Symmetry: D2
Subunit: 123 residues, 4 copies
Amino acid sequence: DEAGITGTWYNQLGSTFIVTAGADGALTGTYESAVGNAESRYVLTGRYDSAPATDGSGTALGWTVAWKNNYRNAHSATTWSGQYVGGAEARINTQWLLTIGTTEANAWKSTLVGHDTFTKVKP
Amino acid sequence: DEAGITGTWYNQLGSTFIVTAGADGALTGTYESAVGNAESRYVLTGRYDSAPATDGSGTALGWTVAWKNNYRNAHSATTWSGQYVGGAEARINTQWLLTIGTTEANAWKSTLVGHDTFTKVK
Amino acid sequence: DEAGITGTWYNQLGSTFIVTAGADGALTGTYESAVGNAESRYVLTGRYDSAPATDGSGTALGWTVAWKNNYRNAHSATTWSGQYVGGAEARINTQWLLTIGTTEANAWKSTLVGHDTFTKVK
Amino acid sequence: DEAGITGTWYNQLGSTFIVTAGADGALTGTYESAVGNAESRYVLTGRYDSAPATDGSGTALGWTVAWKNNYRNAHSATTWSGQYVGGAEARINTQWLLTIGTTEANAWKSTLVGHDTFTKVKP
């Protein structure tokens, strides 16, 4: 699913995820958030299962964005963990954790959790 | 804190995280898991904030391991999201998500959540 | 929102959530899951914000089911944390944590995470 | 485990959880948070597995606090999901979700995630 995963994806917020899957399990590309303390594109890197099960299971993957580029530094990072489901209406279904750099005193409110669904159609 | 993050880290479960932090915000390295359908080292990649706040805040970072190597394939991937906190007893405090490739029917039970704390001494 | 929350709700999986919101902030009722190791209705209890904000914000709430009843015991419990959003197509949008009783050795794989959206129809 | 769970628990933050485990699987009591937009005690309700496994497994449980009492209203709720481990140093190991009421546009940033360990002794 290297070619299936490679492409331009959008989530339900209208964020843009441009990714290349390599033969070796690498994900590389750019992420542009339509919300939050974010402007323009950010580097992403991650991993996917390059030899997945043949039983109709999805392809396990994940990636990270640290929210620093030449325009903005939000002192935060998001990881997405999910699976690619090919076929009719290909979608990447994810859960994510967004951690913000905090003091020790504030560490209890440092991490947001959510869920993003990506498809190749911009909504 | 490129130097602060670069090196060898251990979690509460006896897993080993070996990481280099690049100047550009890259993380790259290897993870060895002491539990689950894992054996030997796995490639990790991630990102960190290479210019953090200067108010005592931690440094945000994250990484991914897909649980495939030359020996095993667990058809799953973990992401760690967290922050590095420097000082005499340096720590990386994380939460993680572990997704297993599932059918659409079983997707509701595809993702585990937990927390790992990494220190520079076991 | 006592009135808007009280009633029968359905999620995307086919599960049924039957709840009463008290004036005091209580949620009480029964949950019927369409998946997993579950049969018939389970007791649920939770709390909601009985005096929400009036700026168009949702109403925070949460509840717990322990997966024991007179048919099954799956030795597990789920909590849903979310918000009620009123209007034409009312919705309760939630994330959930499902913990299974484990030995200390298996506690890293004790907790699933997911998300459920509940509507008044389906 | 009714006797084991019933009582006062303290987390790493110094918050105080006072709970009664009913014979039927009910949890009722009060929560006082040492952090956040919290003052004094708040009602909690939850459930636990009242017929657990006898293989050395923990006892699954969960509870909810809505952060409104007579004194304050933070327009939020937390749920804790976890398990009770009995013994001389008994523990409740939890993960929690804290949801704040938001507009639909800000719903992506409505939910914090964390972990609390509760013991019988002040930390």
